[PDB]
Symmetry: C2
């Protein structure tokens, strides 16, 4: 039985006031920590103050990390620095970084491997564009996942986030059935590549648009283990996703 | 032109080391009328650095994106920086141009947006080892022209000339070479922006500046300060920051 996982990706948003509000909101929500692993991923500059201010039952993660030890990489987040301040999670390979900053499959894998070695849990993001959806959905996520498998032996601290990039800004709303289809394919790939015990423990979270109302409709589908929430994670709605089981 | 000293911490730090580096700067006597001093910590420390370092010292990001708050996972927001009292940023550092392939045009776009949102920008330029053969001025003028194409007002720009071959290699440019590049940069600014703007423009030297070679630069009238790398994490930074005022 895989533990329900809800990540909140704030993206490149925030003010001092809005982050105080979000954090105080999370501190007063009734969390059953036994049945949900909750993590928020604030904009880089807020990482330490978010960890200081949000209660221990909520994880804090970076939105990106570099793949090397501390050194001369101006502008980057260090995995070593992150966990030294108590930031224990990170995203790698988010679609916005694969597209805007052309992060390669191999670069995402190397960041994942290094972050894991340094003690972080990695939410490794994958997903296909609309052109790739025409015929190559399986081939794309399989290729993205294989690059990670080439570098990473231990998947106990990986969770996979499936982003339906094809449904972003295309008028197309990705339905729960369409998500279930891909999540099943991801778990099939993991069974085939890593063995059944890894695949059955591996969280595969949906990273397309979701709210507290249809959260339950998505969780009715057989292979969806939680969510990487985008825009709703800045809003009170995030609490109804985190707390969906109660 | 007020002398400018920046300290680029790059992708370094721990809670313990960052607390003592800042405490070292807090208890260092400064002539703020004489030197504009700024430190650029790793992204995660931006808020705690602004909280802990005395008001006489500015804090800046090591990089910023070129758009308003939105869906750019992993990036620093210029609006968010300003909201929290971070009033500086680097753009175009050579490590970002080389590792992350930031173009002249992207750097110019970031510079313009950061300026519009209220930041002072240390726009970084410089030529490689191969370009040093015969193409030094072709390169820095091209990089500057891209900035001028997007930016009308240079009041809150500082130019940092860091020869790539001098970054982290220990091979400091001699002041005599630095002076002539800066003289060409000021010649370019005179022609492009007018003598008045050119005469107020800070052009600072970066590249293996340390407490032992700092003084030699002060005799050259087109070198308006330093962008210090590895030495900015060391107690000798306390020299470089004050050495103009001695």
């Amino acid at each position: 039985a895989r533990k329900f996982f809800v990540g909140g990706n704030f993206k490149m948003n925030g003010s001092l006031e809005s982050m105080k509000t979000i954090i105080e909101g999370l501190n007063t929500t009734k969390l059953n920590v036994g049945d949900v692993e909750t993590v928020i991923f604030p904009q880089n500059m807020y990482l330490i103050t978010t960890r200081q201010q949000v209660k221990k039952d909520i994880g804090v993660g970076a939105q990106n990390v570099f793949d090397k030890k501390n050194g001369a990489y101006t502008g980057e987040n260090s995995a070593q620095s992150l966990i030294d301040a108590g930031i224990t999670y990170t995203l790698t390979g988010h679609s916005e970084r694969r597209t805007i900053f052309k992060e390669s499959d191999e670069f995402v894998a190397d960041k994942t491997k290094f972050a894991l070695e340094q003690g972080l849990t990695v939410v490794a993001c994958i997903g296909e564009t609309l052109a790739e959806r025409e015929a190559n959905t399986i081939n794309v996520v399989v290729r993205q996942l294989n690059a990670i498998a080439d570098k990473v032996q231990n998947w106990s601290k990986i969770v996979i986030a499936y982003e339906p990039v094809w449904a972003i800004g295309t008028g197309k709303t990705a339905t729960p059935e369409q998500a279930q289809e891909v999540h099943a394919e991801i778990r099939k790939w993991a069974t085939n590549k890593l063995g059944a015990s890894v695949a059955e423990g591996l969280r595969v979270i949906y990273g397309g648009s979701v709210n507290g109302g249809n959260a339950k409709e998505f969780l009715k589908f057989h292979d969806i283990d939680g969510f990487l929430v985008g825009g709703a994670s800045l809003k009170p709605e995030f609490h109804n996703i985190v707390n969906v089981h109660s």
